[PDB]
Design a protein around this ligand. Sequence first.
Ligand SMILES: C[C@@H](O)[C@@H](O)c1cnc2nc(N)[nH]c(=O)c2n1
Ligand SMILES: C[C@@H](O)[C@@H](O)c1cnc2nc(N)[nH]c(=O)c2n1
Ligand SMILES: C[C@@H](O)[C@@H](O)c1cnc2nc(N)[nH]c(=O)c2n1
Ligand SMILES: C[C@@H](O)[C@@H](O)c1cnc2nc(N)[nH]c(=O)c2n1
Ligand SMILES: C[C@@H](O)[C@@H](O)c1cnc2nc(N)[nH]c(=O)c2n1
Ligand SMILES: C[C@@H](O)[C@@H](O)c1cnc2nc(N)[nH]c(=O)c2n1
Ligand SMILES: [Zn+2]
Ligand SMILES: [Zn+2]
Ligand SMILES: [Zn+2]
Ligand SMILES: [Zn+2]
Ligand SMILES: [Zn+2]
Ligand SMILES: [Zn+2]
Lengths: 163, 163, 163, 163, 163, 163
Amino acid sequence: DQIAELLVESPLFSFNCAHFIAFKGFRETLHGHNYNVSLRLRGNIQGDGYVIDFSILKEKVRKVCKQLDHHFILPMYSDVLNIQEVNDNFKITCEDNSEYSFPKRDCVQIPIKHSSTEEIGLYILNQLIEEIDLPFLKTRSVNYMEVTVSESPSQKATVHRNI
Amino acid sequence: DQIAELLVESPLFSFNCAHFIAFKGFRETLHGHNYNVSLRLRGNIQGDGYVIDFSILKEKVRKVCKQLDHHFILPMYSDVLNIQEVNDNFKITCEDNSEYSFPKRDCVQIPIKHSSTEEIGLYILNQLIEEIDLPFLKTRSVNYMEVTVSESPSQKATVHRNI
Amino acid sequence: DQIAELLVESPLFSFNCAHFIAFKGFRETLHGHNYNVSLRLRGNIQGDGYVIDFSILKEKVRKVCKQLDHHFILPMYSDVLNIQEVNDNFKITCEDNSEYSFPKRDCVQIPIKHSSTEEIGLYILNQLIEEIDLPFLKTRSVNYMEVTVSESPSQKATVHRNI
Amino acid sequence: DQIAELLVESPLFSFNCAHFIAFKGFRETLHGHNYNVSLRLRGNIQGDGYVIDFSILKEKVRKVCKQLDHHFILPMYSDVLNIQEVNDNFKITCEDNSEYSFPKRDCVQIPIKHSSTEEIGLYILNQLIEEIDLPFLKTRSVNYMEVTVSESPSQKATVHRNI
Amino acid sequence: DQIAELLVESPLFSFNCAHFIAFKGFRETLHGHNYNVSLRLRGNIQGDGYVIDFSILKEKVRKVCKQLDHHFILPMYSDVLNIQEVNDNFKITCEDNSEYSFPKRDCVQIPIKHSSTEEIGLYILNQLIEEIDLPFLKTRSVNYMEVTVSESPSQKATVHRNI
Amino acid sequence: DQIAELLVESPLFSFNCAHFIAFKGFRETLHGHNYNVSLRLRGNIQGDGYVIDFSILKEKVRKVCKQLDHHFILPMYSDVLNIQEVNDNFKITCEDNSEYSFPKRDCVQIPIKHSSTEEIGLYILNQLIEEIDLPFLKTRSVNYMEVTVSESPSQKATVHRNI
Ligand SMILES: C[C@@H](O)[C@@H](O)c1cnc2nc(N)[nH]c(=O)c2n1
Ligand SMILES: C[C@@H](O)[C@@H](O)c1cnc2nc(N)[nH]c(=O)c2n1
Ligand SMILES: C[C@@H](O)[C@@H](O)c1cnc2nc(N)[nH]c(=O)c2n1
Ligand SMILES: C[C@@H](O)[C@@H](O)c1cnc2nc(N)[nH]c(=O)c2n1
Ligand SMILES: C[C@@H](O)[C@@H](O)c1cnc2nc(N)[nH]c(=O)c2n1
Ligand SMILES: C[C@@H](O)[C@@H](O)c1cnc2nc(N)[nH]c(=O)c2n1
Ligand SMILES: [Zn+2]
Ligand SMILES: [Zn+2]
Ligand SMILES: [Zn+2]
Ligand SMILES: [Zn+2]
Ligand SMILES: [Zn+2]
Ligand SMILES: [Zn+2]
């Protein structure tokens, strides 16, 4: 069997979001990014000529990005943010006592500690594997999944999982 | 005299910002972009071989972008936003009664009606001409200034002024 | 009123097609390209902050490209091609007596003389104006439409219409 | 000895071709792509300062691409295509009884089962190693060869060989 | 007749050169650039489907770039450089009394005052028109020629001629 | 602990330099390039959400590039170049008896044998590790450093060190 690595990258695999980094002793001002996701896979070329169909890969990456797109990225497990539910809003109080308030529908609650490129990358990798389906990947002989998330065309973070 | 057109474009000429479009009957959720600015000018090639030194152009575009960078873009002259000053915060109330609250230092107050690519473009064009200095441009025989602002690698707006 | 130029460009605005150039005294072999379309327009910034919404522009360009995508581009008005209908196929006979046969559903019949980048550009410009709707463009104060079609990242053709 | 990885990538390393994917239970319509090839090598930096001269790498990749360029990619070992020689043409009959006919000179017969990016990649890798010459690579201490073939700027396949 | 604008741009249209800017009161240190040339032309679409064949445009731009490629760019008409012929070398003495010496074959003597992007652009425009041939351009109904030279991906100069 | 790979790449991480390759039996003419450096790191995501802050990486790469920028790259340990100190100049005599002379301030003396992309890459990797500081990288759990240097957008060399 011949091993091949597949890469799917497009300006279409994007989520335009607001966020700010906060950790112990540090907080930055509210801003945003055009985030971009590329997916890399390793496996054997199957009897149909594909390792796995690009169209399937393109479809699932678009779906994960869409869920994030056009929202403030709110880290659920942050140890430095006080996240309060006030009416139909999320109220965020920081260590330096600075206060934010956004409508809940404007926010996407993500099970992460920091809205860093590294942690958003891990979240997307976990979501993509469930979206494409793990046993479906194994039927296509895929044994390696890798996502690259860019905060900007200059700053990229890459995470992987051996499956 | 020989006419030449100069273009300065770089991922460095960027401002990573949060915003949302609001006008009559329409409001979108809070998100963000990696905005990018390119500058185009027309003039005669001077006795020093330049129309105008690229280093000067690169310096001033960076300065204008820096002022916007890492902030929520707040349109001062919006007819559909209620902008209240509450302590050290800006409180924004929309037509649909949705409420936002950001620290003042997280916001950049821009004399525009909408945080659209078109209007941000006009603002930057006006700021760049004052930053480079109008009579300084005329000594270099520059008679045309043009800025292109991109909200994303896919969406661009271009404005100009004949000087 | 402030004049602004809008540009929409994406690898998404693509049609992957087969074709060959044929004119008097010249014929090339069957091949293909990843064609790409960018749209440029000029108008005044309206009271909503837009010249025209990017989402509308992105939607219509995708629709025009989709109609062409994944087909052999067949020039209807070619003076050097003999196009015969044989069962459910198009049979193409060239000046040098070379013969092609494709299923009809594999072909897209385009009202052009040559499948050149220039002529495909004109066709798309005409189709896009009808797709976006001419009187709709005039309500947005758009007076200039321009399409750029690339045969390759290296070879581009640009056509326009004053509206 | 210091290990270095060399990459050669250019829009020049291209073959503009027609093709369609066909396997068991699936057939797509005739279309085309601007295919692009990049080559990656690993080895030790030699006494002349190079692992291997870029000019040699650039020359051989161009030669392999040229052989494919401007043709319909015809898979020789397809289990779902009936390839008939009719006069100076190749007649291709599919499982769904759809019929194609191209002049032989318009086709490039490649020892593959499917004209997929994965299989075209493997073919090019095999051809490039023979073109650069295997024992010539070993004299330059090259122990790893890797080709990346893109069907589009969005879809890439990568294969390698340890030498 | 339908007007179309043709653009040819490639990393292939390059000349990798050494140079330094010198004018009255200013001199910079010796360095180099990967210069890149793109050509833009306007004309009517001819009866063969082309305004002008891209292959002809690609061939002539490559020829002009090749003449410059791999040399020190020496401005012949500089008012601040003392250019002496010493044996098989060019000896260059600057205003600040700094001395350079290169073999003559390493230098390309260009009829310009400064090795600026603007002036190199003008030279290439003049050379390209003569290389493609002026009356040949008029037979193809070309009435506009435009070259863009980039010193870097960030700094570009564009010049034109109405023909 | 979760392993993440960080990539920092920008047209800003550049050094525009003059050079020529010389080794046994071969010498090329003086020319130049827009060199570009990208940095790749592997480590665990720390309690602050970062493997290592991008801003620190961006700052140090800029500093190393700046030291090289706007100079002739002079290889100190070349076995085929006779490097003489004449007044305030470096005089370079080659095997074929060709002579160069540059002011010392125009040259950057680099502890390498050839000004190849491979060897410049190794030098930068060594300089970057000392600039970021080795024990500082170990506190951030970084165990892999990798630099990619491009002579042109087409030609790249990549070197690494396991730390
Ligand atoms: C400056 C802005 O990009 C900020 O959000 C920032 C700064 N440094 C960073 N550093 C890393 N490693 N990851 C990030 O997401 C990151 N993010
Ligand atoms: C610094 C110098 O070598 C180079 O970067 C530079 C700077 N400014 C410039 N400015 C103009 N107008 N043209 C140039 O070629 C130019 N070139
Ligand atoms: C959806 C919105 O946030 C953004 O994608 C968008 C959409 N359409 C737009 N349309 C115009 N004209 N200008 C914009 O800035 C713009 N911006
Ligand atoms: C849609 C078009 O690209 C089609 O030819 C296609 C679809 N899916 C694919 N999927 C893979 N993995 N490789 C291909 O070459 C490929 N090719
Ligand atoms: C060779 C041919 O298939 C293609 O590369 C080509 C070459 N020259 C061209 N020239 C023009 N003007 N338009 C084209 O579409 C064109 N297209
Ligand atoms: C042609 C020009 O790039 C020349 O300096 C050159 C040629 N071949 C090369 N080959 C390698 N491997 N590395 C180089 O830096 C290199 N450099
Ligand atoms: Zn950020
Ligand atoms: Zn937006
Ligand atoms: Zn073609
Ligand atoms: Zn395809
Ligand atoms: Zn320079
Ligand atoms: Zn070189």
